[PDB]
Design a protein around this ligand. Structure first.
Ligand code: OOU
Length: 447
């Protein structure tokens, strides 16, 4: 008997889904995938449930102020989102002390502006918790109630839990290769060289995006082989690949991203007004996604701002990872013109077809420049031959206005002519994640 309790409200969408009042209790039967088979004790109706809507009855996951499965950086982004107030907080699993916890608190001061401060919650050997030795607690709930009453050494008195929203429904069971009839294409979002993108509805209940590839552009078997790898590249900063239609014209079904391409967003009324530290955060998010791709020994091949998508909450997600590999070169695709962009591509990829994670690093440097110029064409005033010849002679784009020198230094590292001399995305991710807090302590040393 493994027992869980519902967190959010969820109703039937598929064959056998159940009732989810905000506080119903159930027993887990099976645990394969993100959909769990389970039986309820309330009115005892049965079927399948979304695992991310439930939580173990004795676990901290039931608490409003506990955020399971997020990082320190995630925590900071979430707390700094609009709608949160001074003293907004969360408790999360510690990233640097396994089994222990961390408290993250939204702070403000006129010098540093909006920040998030982090505290180590230590566990007592015989039970309980403390941040400072003079104030111990039997439960994390007692700790929270204590610091809601007064700061007692913290940067702020705790106010309310970090705002959150009901998570995405997990994708339907075993609906990887889906029938084309399951999709109603509702709005064409754009047309490109080798296909179109539509907003669509999947089986009357789920909003998705559908990339519709032109006949002649891809092979079903080649595409599917690659797509079966793509779908496993699951990370908060990569766009989620839900499903495919494995018949020409091949369809690629992904999560819908409300603010479209980062390139378009940077050139929009709203995006053109993002302050520099937000631009840096965008850059960090993309680098986190690319560090994942690097860790997974994968290659993007066409990294640039056009292929970054932006969510309604301004989360950046990498799209089209690996796709260029399975776009075919034939009479059909040739009729369009110009497969990959010279100004974004590493010289060894151009010259020899050597695409690697290091040519992606080169491209990332170009993307950084796209970001800090709000979407300007790379190498303004230069033709493609001019770019290639200048690069060969050690020319690189100069630092533009409103670009921190350290950011430009990262670009210059990305643009080493020898690929082995370019940094790892693991390195880039670390320097961008800590861009403004490099000389600052990890956690607050509270007395
Ligand atoms: C004037 N501006 C325009 O015309 C610009 C295009 C320019 C920025 C170049 N117009 C474009 C701007 C991006 C728009 N777009 C593309 C995708 C997408 C991307 C990749 C997908 O497939 C994948 C394949 C492999 C791995 C991951 C995903 C699926 C959907 C997408 C989405 N999921 N949600 C929302 N908008 C999306 C479409 C119209």
């Amino acid at each position: 008997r493994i027992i869980v309790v519902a967190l959010y409200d969820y109703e039937a969408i598929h064959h056998e889904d159940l009732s989810f009042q905000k506080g119903d209790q159930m027993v887990v039967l099976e645990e394969s995938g993100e959909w769990w088979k389970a039986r309820s004790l309330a009115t005892r109706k049965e079927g399948y449930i979304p695992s991310n809507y439930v939580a173990r009855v004795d676990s901290l996951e039931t608490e409003e102020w506990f955020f399971k499965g997020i990082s320190r950086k995630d925590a900071e982004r979430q707390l700094l989102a609009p709608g949160n107030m001074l003293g907004s907080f969360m408790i999360r699993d510690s990233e640097t002390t396994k089994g222990s916890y961390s408290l993250s608190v939204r702070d403000y001061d006129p010098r540093q502006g909006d920040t998030v401060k982090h505290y180590k919650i230590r566990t007592l050997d015989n039970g309980g918790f403390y941040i400072s030795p003079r104030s111990t607690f039997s439960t994390l709930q007692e700790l929270v109630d204590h610091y809601k009453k007064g700061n007692d050494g913290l940067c702020q008195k705790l106010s309310v839990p970090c705002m959150s929203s009901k998570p995405q429904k997990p994708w339907e069971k075993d609906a990887w290769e889906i029938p084309r009839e399951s999709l109603k294409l509702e709005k064409k979002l754009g047309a490109g060289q080798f296909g179109e993108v539509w907003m669509a509805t999947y089986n009357k209940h789920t909003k998705v995006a559908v990339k519709t590839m032109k006949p002649g552009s891809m092979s079903v078997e080649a595409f599917l082989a690659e797509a079966n790898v793509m779908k496993t590249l699951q990370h908060d900063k990569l766009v989620k690949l839900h499903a495919v239609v494995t018949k020409e014209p091949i369809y690629i079904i992904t999560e819908f991203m409300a603010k479209g391409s980062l390139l378009d967003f940077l050139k929009s009324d709203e995006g053109s007004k993002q302050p520099l530290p937000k631009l840096i955060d965008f850059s960090a998010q993309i680098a986190e996604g690319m560090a994942f791709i690097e860790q997974r020994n994968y290659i993007h091949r066409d990294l640039r701002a056009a292929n970054i998508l932006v969510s309604a909450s301004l989360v950046c997600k990498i799209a089209d990872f690996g796709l260029a590999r399975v776009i075919e070169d034939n009479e059909y695709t040739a009729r369009e013109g110009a497969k990959f962009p010279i100004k974004w591509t590493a010289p060894e990829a151009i010259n020899f077809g050597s695409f690697t994670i290091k040519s992606d690093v080169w491209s990332f440097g170009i993307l950084l420049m796209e970001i800090v110029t709000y979407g300007r064409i790379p190498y303004p005033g230069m033709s493609n031959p001019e770019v290639i010849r200048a690069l060969e002679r050690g020319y690189r784009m100069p630092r533009p206005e409103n670009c921190p020198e350290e950011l430009y230094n990262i670009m210059m590292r990305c643009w080493k002519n020898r690929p082995e001399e370019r940094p790892t995305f693991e390195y880039i991710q670390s320097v961008l994640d800590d861009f403004y807090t490099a000389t600052e302590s990890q956690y607050e040393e509270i007395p």
